[PDB]
Amino acid sequence: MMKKIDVKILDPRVGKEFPLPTYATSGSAGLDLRACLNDAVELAPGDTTLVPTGLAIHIADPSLAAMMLPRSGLGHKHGIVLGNLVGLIDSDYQGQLMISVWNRGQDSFTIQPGERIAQMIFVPVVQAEFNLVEDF
Amino acid sequence: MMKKIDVKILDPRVGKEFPLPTYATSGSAGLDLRACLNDAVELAPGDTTLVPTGLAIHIADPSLAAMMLPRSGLGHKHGIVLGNLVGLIDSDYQGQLMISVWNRGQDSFTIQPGERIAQMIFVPVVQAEFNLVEDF
Amino acid sequence: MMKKIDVKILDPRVGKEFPLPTYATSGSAGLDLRACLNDAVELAPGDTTLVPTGLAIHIADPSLAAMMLPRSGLGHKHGIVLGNLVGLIDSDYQGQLMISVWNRGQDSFTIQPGERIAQMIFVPVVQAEFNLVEDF
Ligand code: EMC
Ligand code: EMC
Ligand code: EMC
């Protein structure tokens, strides 16, 4: 299920120091996002840091959203997850994609420039039109 | 992608002390949910509390579900997230929407009556019909 | 919205020591997943453990994915959630479903063999085809 999504590159290292996000396979659900950093960031246990990506998207279609999730291995094996748990990207958001990275475990972890640190999925969304009732 | 969803108001302060949830824009994916509280609740680091909303929905359509997520800023900046991480609302649920609020950070936070504390998205869902195989 | 999904049973206790996952009702969004364990696992506060299910799926349809979520009560009441927060299962994954269980709270918890420890939802997904722009 393909959908064209506009992407703007904000930092000149993207596509060159490290690549633009790509699906691993035609059956992949997520896209890995990489840390756009001038220097590595050490995260102590319990620490949160805001990691730029150097990228912006504009989904535009109000029937689509993106969700940012932890990478599976980072989360399970290293306790490196998202500070907001799941990061919802609305169809009208056009700012830089920023990743809230939280060390939920007990071991310090250093995020290297270019390292894949999160993933993003695109899912259909619906807007509720509420119908007020006083009994179901 | 609009869908009519029945909503029932359980507490008389809703729509008056604070408003019914509304989408910020026609491109918003989520709806913010507000804390329906008689008094402010201080959450110490590591603390979880169950926050009422004063609202119930009945999605009814078995091809739709809701997901409750942290607010982005609360999560990243203040460590105020969900104790169940992501809260799934089934199409047949008709009870009050309750928010499990967890302080995952290091700073105490007080939830004020009426404060937006979570968000909710509506997503299509599929029920699996399993086909048992002994090799893929 | 039903979709046939191939399932393979990897451990002979499945469907016999404990059952194959089933939807509670025709309106349920999620499927509970059970711990396939030879002995109970005590999780101290802050601990993560990798729990087998004894099952594999092969979604196959690149327009569908699965998301593994905490159970609501386990998360809110007991602080038993997922170490990767949300676990994304791609359409091409055909390995065993493994659950990263993390004790995010302050009380030790023992996972019993057969206990329901997570839930899984099936959601449509889209693959982005990026359109590079230099201004939105
Ligand atoms: C770090 C600004 Hg890429
Ligand atoms: C707090 C019952 Hg609104
Ligand atoms: C625990 C191998 Hg079921």
The 3-state secondary structure of C45-90, one letter per residue: CCCEEEEEEEEEEECCCCCEEEEEECCHHHHHHHCEEECCCCEEEC
Touching C: which chains, 3+ CB pairs < 8 A?
A, B
User: C50 touching A, CB under 8 A?
Assistant: yes
Beta strands A2-9; C127-133: pairing state: parallel
| Separation CA B39–CA C28 (nearest Å) | 34
| Separation CA A2–CA B1 (nearest Å) | 18
B83, A48, C83, B50: CA torsion to nearest 10: 0
Nearest to C53 by CA among C23, C95, C83, C110: C95
**DSSP state letter for C18:** B
| Separation CA B125–CA C132 (nearest Å) | 31
CB C54 within 8 A of CB C96: yes
Question: Mind spelling out the 3-state secondary structure of chain A?
Answer: CEEEEEEEECCCCECCCECCCCCCCCCCCCEEEECCCCCCEEECCCCEEEEEEEEEEECCCCCEEEEEECCHHHHHHHCEEECCCCEEECCCCCCEEEEEEEECCCCCEEECCCCEEEEEEEEECEEEEEEEECCC
| Separation CA C51–CA C29 (nearest Å) | 22
Elucidation technique: X-ray
CB C106 within 8 A of CB C40: no
Query: What is the resolution in angstroms?
Result: 1.0
> What fold, for A1-136?
Deoxyuridine 5'-Triphosphate Nucleotidohydrolase; Chain A (2.70.40)
CB A61 within 8 A of CB B62: no
CB C82 within 8 A of CB C100: yes
Question: Measuring from each residue's beta carbon to the nearest atom of ligand 3, which residues come in under 6 Å?
Answer: C 11, 36-38, 52, 54
Quick check: helix, strand or coil at residue B100?
strand
Rg of the Cα atoms in chain B? 17
CB C67 within 8 A of CB A72: no
Q: Which two tokens stand for residue C64?
A: 């569908």
Say whether B5 and A136 touch across the interface (CB within 8 A): no
| Number of C-beta neighbours around residue B110 at 10 A | 9
User: Domain boundaries in chain A?
Assistant: 1-136
Say whether C46 and A119 touch across the interface (CB within 8 A): no
| Separation CA C78–CA C108 (nearest Å) | 9
Q: Which protein residue has the closest C-alpha to ligand 1 atom 1?
A: A37
Rounded to the nearest angstrom, the distance between the alpha carbon of A13 and the centre of ligand 1 is 9
Burial profile C81-90: b = 16 or more Cβ within 10 angstroms, e = fewer? bbbbbbbbbb
CB B60 within 8 A of CB A130: no
Q: Which protein residue has the closest C-alpha to ligand 1 atom 3?
A: A36
Burial profile A89-127: b = 16 or more Cβ within 10 angstroms, e = fewer? bbbebeeebbbbbbbbbeeebebeebbbbbbbbbbbbbb
Touching A: which chains, 3+ CB pairs < 8 A?
B, C
Nearest to B84 by CA among A86, C123, C114: A86
Ligand nearest to the CA of A12: 1
| Separation CA C108–CA B62 (nearest Å) | 36
| Separation CA A59–CA A65 (nearest Å) | 7
Q: Which of B1, B5, B81 sits opposite A124 (nearest CB)?
A: B1
Q: A114 Cβ partners below 8 Å, 6+ apart?
A: A17, A18, A34, A35, A36, A37
Q: A77 Cβ partners below 8 Å, 6+ apart?
A: none
Q: Which two tokens stand for residue A60?
A: 């535009």
Quick check: helix, strand or coil at residue B77?
helix
